[PDB]
Amino acid sequence: TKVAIVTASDSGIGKACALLLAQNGFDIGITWHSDERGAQETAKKAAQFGVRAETIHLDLSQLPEGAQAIEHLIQRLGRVDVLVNNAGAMTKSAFIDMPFTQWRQIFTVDVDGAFLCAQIAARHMIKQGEGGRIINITSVHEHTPLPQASAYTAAKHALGGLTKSMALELIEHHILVNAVAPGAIATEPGSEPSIPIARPGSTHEIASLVAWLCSEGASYTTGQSLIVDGGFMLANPQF
Amino acid sequence: QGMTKVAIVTASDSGIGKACALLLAQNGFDIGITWHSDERGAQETAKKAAQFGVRAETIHLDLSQLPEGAQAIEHLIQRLGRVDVLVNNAGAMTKSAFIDMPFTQWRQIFTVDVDGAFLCAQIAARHMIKQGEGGRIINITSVHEHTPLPQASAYTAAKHALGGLTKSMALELIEHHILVNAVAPGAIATEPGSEPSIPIARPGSTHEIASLVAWLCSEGASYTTGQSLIVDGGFMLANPQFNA
Amino acid sequence: MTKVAIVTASDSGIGKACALLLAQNGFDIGITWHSDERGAQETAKKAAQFGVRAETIHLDLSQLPEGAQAIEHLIQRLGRVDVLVNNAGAMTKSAFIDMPFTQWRQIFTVDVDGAFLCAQIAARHMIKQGEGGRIINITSVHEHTPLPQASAYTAAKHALGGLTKSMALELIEHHILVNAVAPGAIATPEPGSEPSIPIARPGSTHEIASLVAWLCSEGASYTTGQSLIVDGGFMLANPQF
Amino acid sequence: MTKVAIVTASDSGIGKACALLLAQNGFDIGITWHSDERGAQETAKKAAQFGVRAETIHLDLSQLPEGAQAIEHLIQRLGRVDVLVNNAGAMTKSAFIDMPFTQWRQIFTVDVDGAFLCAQIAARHMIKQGEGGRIINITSVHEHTPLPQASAYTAAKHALGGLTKSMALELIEHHILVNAVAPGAIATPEPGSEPSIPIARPGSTHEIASLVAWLCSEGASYTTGQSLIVDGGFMLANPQFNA
């Protein structure tokens, strides 16, 4: 029985990932920043699939200590085979007068935290000796800028580069590392005509790919950023 | 049975095409199989496909003389009665030094590696639009849609071409609920430690491509379109510093 | 030793701007024209006022491979070739679902098949001369992102992008550097005229030619296999723009 | 009117080459150094032979944000800033699995945090001046492809490439153009010495500085938001590259 940990799975993409992985037979670890009740609800529904589901408080704003909750969560579940580094909320702030503390705060939660969590998970995966899967939830803005969100863009890009480096260095341990880059996700047909598919995506349309990356059939996929965006990246000033 | 969807996979007599055809049959698609010269392999794929309780039909496809050779796709569609999935599967790679390559060889490689996929895609998309129920088109390209293969400039350029067409089709067919993506294999075997130049140190299996192609045909992929999804055991990660 | 640059379709637009700026840089110039010979001669007359030799030749890349032989004759006239600029011809739109196969092939013929044959001819001479060379393929932002209703154009630009990387890898041993210049929207004969582009205007032909000329310069000797995008921010604008 | 170029870490290597070439192109030059005040002063003396002003200042990008004030004092001495070249410090290697957090942070501090604070200051002056400007971020091929045993370096270079795109979009209305120049292997004081690279040698610092100088020139007025890779074909070599 394998174990999947999904950060920030009290809601949104994280919750959909945790629920689908439970459906697929993984014991589940759920982390929460502020909303323990949402984490409890996800745990309950995850456990309804006949699976163990454990929750822990994780606040990646005070580092490195804040990341130790991943170590406690792994110890409660006995092992870890999957880590989904799920992205927190997006923040807008003009580049020209952004305070350095805000710049650092955004990097702390959006890439520093993922780095520390991945280290902890990858260490256990190496010792277990049975490989593993690490999925970094990034964004289209790993590849293309979000207006008025320069720190968010830069940190998503950083996490994209970290994904590549982790995949290269951990492949010898059969740990495959990929990013899933969502476009606009609603958290109805024709609601966003700026996007070629003309609607936002569902959390399921992201979780379904995350689940595939955890499946036996993904055993040759590593180092990639898989963009799930309804054609967002194809729309240029011409479209 | 009125709800049964049809997948057509070109060159599914063997290799990656065969793996896609059989997995899609196992997942519940009636299957169209095309073959260039290995008819018995095509008959063996149809045999196994039908053990999953679906229809399987085969047809000879000779993409060497275009546009006429692509009509076999229209005949296969007619036999199956509809098409919901097309997998434009990649023929064999060809090598030739750039400085000396005959024009005939340049044109021959483009003929099989992007002109055919263009024509097959048109035919399938016309049926998908008329059917009015959407569809999925997967173009099997290669890591060389993105990075060059030495001594294979024609092949690289044609894979790049097919990547561009993928993006164009995705944009132009989205209004008909047709999602269009490329799957870009690294080196796939036709084992651990057998390919030291690749980070994962081995070639891929055909199942390791087919599995993603199957996911792209599933309900969960309804928001994925216009992308090149690379399955290469880390091939794209390996640069000059991968040494030592 | 006076170096030679050949620029296809330099009777007008970007090709003319590259030919004239390379002329000012001290290259002898080869100029090809499809139908406007007087425009080509006008380019040659202006290039020659910079004190270099300029030569014109008809080039029709629609009938291949014979059509590309004009490049060989231009080189024989000029005595050598050091720079080839494969310039981009006109863009044509055609719906993907309806596009006839002959139109598909026609567009690939002029937009990548012709560049391939010209590049071969120039590279053969650069190899034999033994003094390296530079080949610049003018592509487009649509080497990288689709142009709606122009699937053939987009596919061919992508193809020329791949050829560029392939040529650069195989010709590096002869010190031949191969790159693409990928323009966005370029005006041919002002601020705020194109609000959908972050710069809010189309580019000038000079703003493309300037980089082509840098790519032919001594300082560019470590740059090969790349697609340099000159687009006023075009690639940055997504539905969030 | 005399324009001003500020190049960080121009006491040596790529930064020094950029400073000297911009001095030849007529920019008054601002030079920063981390420890080698002497390389900096030799850079200034040679820049001054081109008839321009050269000012040197210590820049401690390791302890921020206060260290970035050194850029304000430089702009004060030179009177304005028209070009900023964000030039990278030294590369540090460390395995991802056990890389200390302090080292992850130090690498980000010098590879993107300093560039971010310096670009902010430079941009505020370019807006105040009202005559546009050019900001060049020196990244790396590693902005695009990983460097083994250098995950923090790779991540931080990716971050600086993303910041580059965001700044280009956000500053375009002020006619401030922002690009990255992404060098491959660059030599510091020969053909065939790097066979893993298709060109089979490292690059010269002048082969980077030349593109940086073009990006500051009149003809580069339509180029923004891009990452211009100068790498001798590094990006073309994959597992199938040989010999």
From TrEMBL, chain C:
SUPFAM superfamilies: NAD(P)-binding Rossmann-fold domains
Entry-linked InterPro entries: NAD(P)-bd_dom_sf (IPR036291), Sc_DH/Rdtase_CS (IPR020904), SDR (IPR050259), SDR_fam (IPR002347)
GO biological process per UniProt: monocarboxylic acid metabolic process
CDD domains (alphabetical): SDR_c (cd05233)
GO molecular function terms attached to this record: oxidoreductase activity
Pfam families: adh_short_C2
Entry keywords, A to Z: Oxidoreductase
Family: Belongs to the short-chain dehydrogenases/reductases (SDR) family.
Protein name: Oxidoreductase UcpA
Native organism: Salmonella typhimurium (strain LT2 / SGSC1412 / ATCC 700720)
Gene that this sequence comes from: yohF
Automatic annotation (TrEMBL), chain D:
Keyword Oxidoreductase: yes
PROSITE patterns xref list: ADH_SHORT
Family: Belongs to the short-chain dehydrogenases/reductases (SDR) family.
CDD domains hit by this protein: SDR_c
Coiled coil spans: none
Gene Ontology biological process terms from the UniProt entry: monocarboxylic acid metabolic process
Xref: Pfam families: adh_short_C2
Key word Cell cycle present: no
UniProt protein name: Oxidoreductase UcpA
Record-level Gene Ontology MF annotations: oxidoreductase activity
Keywords in alphabetical order: Oxidoreductase
